[PDB]
Symmetry: D2
Subunit: 385 residues, 4 copies
């Protein structure tokens, strides 16, 4: 029947991820946000504390956990700082294409080193001209003998200048008439090969400690043994990846929303106005209630989406719903938390202005709020005929 | 482990309820809404179909179903007509106070009689001067011999004019500072007793075939044997009830929303404007997506609150979140369903305007949206 | 300079409409909502009290008033019952096409008799298969000598079976490739002419006492003397009628909204729960404040739309904003008004459940919420190019 | 009657501030934001152009303008940067207390020096333990002979470390049971006085170039001739000031919102996805339309609030609504302007992310969002008794 209970093993990872978040990530989050420095120390702890590369099949050294677990751990991380969390989750995002679109050797080779040493990887789809419109990417790949020459630009790549290797999507069919399901190719490209030119670190409003940047691929030579499933199967792999990784993303948002809620509540029991605590004012009580309600509902949506794909079924529908809802309520709670703090909440000495800045990104990456509505609409309507 | 899978027994109960709603409730819900006559026929078919009193334990002829099971059946019902469905649920609301508060006799006596024949009971707590402030009711009760003389009135009682027996909250202690947790007493009262003056059928905006009205009690006499757990445990029996009834009530609102969503979606795939199908205009697509999203979230919220109580764990927190949310998105989905229909949506010859009129009630009874907030804040600032 | 002051004369019109609405309309609107009976008695009294046909030029016996004036009166009327008000304001809608699109003769004939006798007229554009898309209408008009043969059907026509004459829009050019600006013609059709088959009174959830029904035109022969400006200038006239007529509609929703606010406001100061008036519960205070806020803002927007057209400038941008907003908040206050009444609110013995039923239509007729956004988006974006 | 036409004079002011704003503020706004450096060059410049101290009576060298005028000017300014505009507007805030509560001598002395040289002043009410609850301030003032000894702490003071003179609200009656309308007194304090300790500069999320800080007052001696109207008239002077300064703060929000709307529009007319310009996608056009709708309504509201006070009528009701609404729609428009920009919108190399960090303050200062509801609710209930 129905069950919202956790296995004893899951309650274990959760306790571990939680401790690590409230004891290690939280005391340093404020400083990494200010200095925009890559959180190398924290990424190593998470590595030896088994909180990273969770999805890598144990057939290569991984724990072989499932999307339910990734979300479970990720929510505890995001609670500390989604900046560190995004860098961590970026690894899963880049690995997944290999897990569902790669052969044994490719996984043994690129996934195996991830469990052996604390390396990082990245997902390369987005370009300057196209992001939401994946079908419009212009980065190319031509075959020369047993190789592929790759030329193009990638923009906004997470872990972009810190990855050992990259998952790269490039158009292989020059014919403009070529359909999306046959014009692209997923390649696994090592970062040190001659031709990849890493750009500068972009400076964004939130998740500052995270490394995000552009990359130029100029006459990059990739050996044929590096094409994932085959020339022309890149798009499906890309789509499959998003369904697998959108749930954990949505989980990151609820993690951020939780943080907002706890802060808002803690302060609401300390500050007094007109003779009573902020929480004793019905106005504020309803605000707090409406916040809690939303975090619970967003957590349910991602659990449902994770479970679905984990059970082996296509979860595009539930996945998008969770991403959309969690993203929107993550922002709503971020600003309401700042709100109950009054002037103090607008100040950097307090923890909430950072939350409002980190939150905006959830409505944009891994499919914007709009694109998610296009997906949900296309799946919902497909059911009526 | 995590699971959102229904058991074969539930995929069976559900198939039955869905059939009863799609094929039998839906082709007549329209006329019952217009006329407003208590849909006795449908209530007989529900009963003899197992879809009623679904909570009475086997020991008395009932199926002894759980809260999760009850919500799965309700959603399918409401999807047809929340008017008919509310008639049905008003039954388990009058029953639960007996299941959780009454002794074997009382239970065998009044619950057993419900499995033998298609009878109806009612829950009487609300009065004219108090609905939300449940601790403020005035219906009195004074003991005399092995009897309690009850005096007072109630209002908005569902199945009030169609009930065999009533669960009834009255104030036993006449002391002002009497601690709420000892000032009230619950009673299972029979409709045929002297002094029970039933009122006219109250006419409302939605859920019109349902029976709702005021009941005045004047010197009604109740034998101490009908006093539920004991003289004074009233407030506790009444409160403990909500923890079981709220989940189903939210699943009802979700069924309505599911119906509205379906109607609007089919129409959008039929009506054409500007050389395009309504569903092809990005503006409408987004509307549809947001509606889908809200239905799926409201559904999960009640499943969570049900599973919580079915597990023996107190579920006030999750229950109120499901009730609060489901009520809101049911009203929002009703108005948007009317919106996609256009002029037709505003018309009586179409199915959507009824939904909009029905929905509104979910924000009012069984604890208003405002009261649901007060509870969610109390429980949250409690964890 | 800026002024939100009413001229002494406008202060008079308002006081008339107000008294009329609160002493004569309110006392009987509930029965009319029930019976669905045309409110002839109230229309008669509205006519003599000078509250109707407000826009007809003095040249033809009218008050010569303007849109700002037309709105001030409507809001007061709507406060009583938008069912009655929509019946009255429908006359204005049907009259505008003549006032801005006809010659002296046409205006003397049809506009003139409205000042002498309490007749009613109607606006016939919407068909069963095309409403939001006026360029979609399929009722044709054919030139047979010095006459026009009209054939087609119209749906949802206010004052549809109570009108003396009708303004009708019919495609006059069969060429499917013909521009909408050149393919239509507006006519003036007298109801008694042979061929006009009036349908049944339609039953609706709200504004129940207003006459709204379908109408078929079977070989109706209208004289060229009744063509508005010319053959092919019908689309512009209608577009021009909406900008002029949309503001009063908005002012109409503001009336309904103001009514809801008062009812709820008067109850909240009466009903007591948990030992306090509803009003003393901050949760309800804030609720009331938001309603007040929305009504004030909606009132301001229709005033800005009336002034713009009254100053001789095309007011499309402003009319749409006012209509869209007033409609959205008129619906929001209806359900919140029912909400503060609680149980009673859902009962037909209390005035608010009717408000909720009447309100929904403001988001549909005279341009649906969605179309308003299209128009607004068109006006706004044109200013950057 | 009704008018929405600017007098030829206001059209001049407006055109000047617009020019100054789009060609002098905008070009350097991003830099002052990144450094948080106080914009002295722009302030001296504004003072030169007459876009400052606008409300000072002309018999003191001032323009003698009104609130509506201040709102017209502030909106243009805020459009360039609400960081720069807040520094300017904070001057009016500090001056009003003298305008409505000081005698002739005090005004020529303090308001006079402002017109002769580009000085700055501040408003001192908020303390660290009380902001919304003005009646809860602890700063004490006692009368010793012909002077008052001031002791207390203030916090979040705009222009706090750049003021020549301060308006200070202190409690002059130790009797805790004394009414709020009799326990405070407003003093005008010179910053160079012994005992005034300026705090460091506080670092906030938005309006970073604005100067804001706390200030300690150790036994600050103040001549009795510096008491504004008299002992105990402090609450009313402060309350009276907020009614006049609330419309302007609201106008600042609609300026920031207008800036958001323009950037969003211009980008939607350039960025291309799925073969069309963003503005071509209906989901996006609808968003732009709603954004446009709010700005027009927010602007309309502060216009109504300014006009009511210039006319010599208590405008508490209208001021709070305009302030409450503009505040919200500014935050809504900010985050949605970032949305249309995509990943770019989240990047600091673009103008929108700054607009989002700045907008959040409008729901906090000059009376928080919740406090405005308390006022609107009360004024509203007052109309039913
Ligand atoms: C915290 C963790 C770290 C994260 C750090 S940030 C990381 C990142 O941001 S990664 C970048 C994210 N990129 C996006 O979200 C892009 C959003 N766009 C899309 O998803 C799609 O282009 C779209 C808009 C949905 C689709 O557009 P279309 O071009 O129109 O494709 P279609 O025509 O719909 O379909 C073409 C074929 O693909 C098949 N398809 C579509 N969806 C799916 C799914 N979900 N699974 C499998 N196959 C799919 C479709 O069936 C078509 O196939 P045919 O066989 O030809 O019929
Ligand atoms: C599908 C449709 C079918 C048709 C259905 S029509 C049927 C109906 O509409 S229901 C009848 C109408 N009545 C209502 O809606 C009441 C709504 N509830 C409320 O508003 C309550 O005031 C409240 C807000 C919930 C509570 O307010 P309070 O006055 O402040 O009391 P509490 O503090 O909650 O409780 C005090 C004592 O109650 C006990 N308690 C509290 N929570 C619980 C739970 N969860 N389980 C059991 N007991 C509980 C508690 O023990 C307190 O007493 P003690 O002194 O500790 O013994
Ligand atoms: C009073 C209360 C009591 C009674 C209450 S109930 C009464 C009623 O319901 S009456 C029924 C109302 N019907 C509607 O609201 C329909 C809404 N749809 C529309 O407004 C238009 O189709 C549209 C969506 C705006 C336009 O769609 P399009 O087909 O795409 O036309 P466009 O391409 O935009 O324009 C084509 C030409 O028309 C000209 N045009 C458009 N707007 C105007 C205005 N405002 N003035 C002048 N001309 C206008 C446009 O310029 C085009 O022509 P050109 O050749 O370029 O000159
Ligand atoms: C763009 C510019 C650049 C700089 C930007 S940053 C600038 C700033 O931040 S300035 C600081 C802002 N702080 C605030 O806005 C705080 C909001 N709080 C309040 O307004 C009031 O405390 C309140 C909540 C409305 C009232 O609370 P109460 O304590 O409960 O007072 P009351 O008991 O309601 O009333 C007490 C007496 O005062 C009288 N009163 C109230 N309002 C008014 C007005 N508007 N005019 C005159 N008198 C007023 C009221 O009548 C009471 O009178 P009695 O004589 O005592 O009977
Ligand atoms: C911090 C950060 C980290 C990132 N990390 C990665 C990474 O690791 N790997 C990676 O591949 N990418 C990454 N990205 C890129 C991100 O996934 C893309 O930037 C985003 O999906 C790109 O879309 P766009 O910016 O082109 O937006 P566009 O959508 O093209 O334009 C902006 C607006 O257009 C709207 N829009 C577009 N098309 C439509 C339509 N048809 N209908 C309605 N609305 C529409 C969008 O909703 C949006 O609001 C990152 C971005 C950021 C900011
Ligand atoms: C950049 C900046 C510049 C400033 N400049 C100035 C200046 O020049 N002069 C000046 O005097 N002040 C200034 N301030 C201070 C501003 O006016 C105050 O910060 C604000 O009014 C302070 O409220 P608070 O921070 O104490 O909030 P508090 O309200 O005390 O606490 C936070 C929360 O409590 C809620 N709350 C409080 N009471 C109630 C109630 N009864 N009912 C419901 N909700 C309630 C609030 O809505 C809020 O969300 C500035 C602040 C900032 C951030
Ligand atoms: C169709 C229908 C069927 C019904 N069937 C039954 C039945 O079978 N049995 C039964 O017992 N009752 C029944 N009722 C009654 C329903 O349970 C009550 O109407 C509802 O709980 C009554 O509250 P009230 O109307 O007294 O509202 P009150 O709340 O007293 O007053 C109206 C408003 O006050 C607000 N409010 C009250 N207190 C507070 C507070 N402290 N803070 C903030 N806001 C507050 C509420 O949210 C509400 O909007 C039925 C009602 C309807 C409409
Ligand atoms: C009580 C009443 C009185 C009336 N009186 C009159 C009268 O006197 N004269 C008269 O002429 N008409 C009258 N009407 C008709 C009213 O003007 C029309 O019903 C309405 O404009 C018709 O549109 P539709 O119903 O065909 O809508 P349709 O648009 O066909 O369908 C409704 C849905 O489609 C959406 N939609 C359509 N096109 C698009 C698009 N391109 N993009 C996004 N969404 C879109 C709409 O927004 C809406 O939600 C009346 C209607 C009613 C209910």
């Amino acid at each position: 029947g129905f069950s919202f209970e956790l296995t004893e093993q899951q309650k274990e990872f959760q306790a571990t991820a939680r401790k690590f978040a409230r004891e290690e990530i939280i005391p340093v989050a404020a400083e990494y946000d200010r200095t925009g420095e890559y959180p190398v120390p924290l990424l190593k702890r998470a590595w030896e504390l088994g909180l990273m590369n969770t999805h890598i099949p144990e057939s290569f050294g991984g724990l072989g956990l499932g999307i339910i677990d990734s979300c479970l751990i990720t929510e505890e991380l995001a609670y500390g700082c989604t900046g560190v969390q995004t860098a961590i989750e970026a690894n899963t995002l880049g690995q997944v294409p290999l897990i569902i679109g790669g052969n044994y050797q490719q996984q043994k080779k690129y996934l195996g080193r991830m469990t052996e040493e604390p390396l990082m990887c990245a997902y390369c789809v987005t370009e300057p001209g196209a992001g939401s419109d994946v079908a419009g990417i212009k980065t190319k790949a031509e075959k020369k003998g047993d190789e592929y020459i790759i030329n193009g630009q990638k923009m906004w790549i997470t872990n972009g200048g810190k990855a050992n290797w990259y998952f790269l999507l490039a158009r292989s069919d020059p014919d403009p008439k070529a359909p999306a399901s046959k014009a692209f190719t997923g390649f696994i490209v090592e970062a040190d090969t001659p031709g990849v030119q890493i750009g500068r670190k972009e400076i964004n409003m939130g998740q500052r400690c995270s490394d995000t940047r552009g990359i130029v691929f100029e006459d990059v030579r990739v050996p044929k043994e590096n094409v994932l499933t085959g020339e022309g199967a890149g798009f499906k792999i890309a789509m499959g990846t998003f369904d697998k990784t959108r749930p954990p993303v949505a989980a990151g948002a609820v993690g951020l929303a939780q943080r907002a809620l706890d802060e808002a509540t803690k302060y609401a029991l300390e500050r007094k106005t007109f003779g009573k605590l902020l929480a004793e004012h019905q106005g504020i009580s309803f605000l707090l209630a409406d916040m809690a309600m939303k975090v619970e509902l967003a957590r349910l949506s991602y659990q449902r989406a994770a479970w679905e794909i984990d059970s082996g079924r296509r979860n595009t529908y539930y996945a998008s719903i969770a991403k959309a809802y969690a993203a929107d309520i993550a922002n709503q709670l971020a600003t309401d938390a700042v709100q109950v703090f009054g002037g103090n909440g607008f100040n950097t000495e307090y923890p909430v202005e950072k939350l409002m800045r980190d939150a905006k990104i959830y409505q944009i990456y891994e499919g914007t709020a709009q694109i998610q509505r296009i997906i949900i609409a296309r799946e919902h309507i497909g059911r009526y005929k």
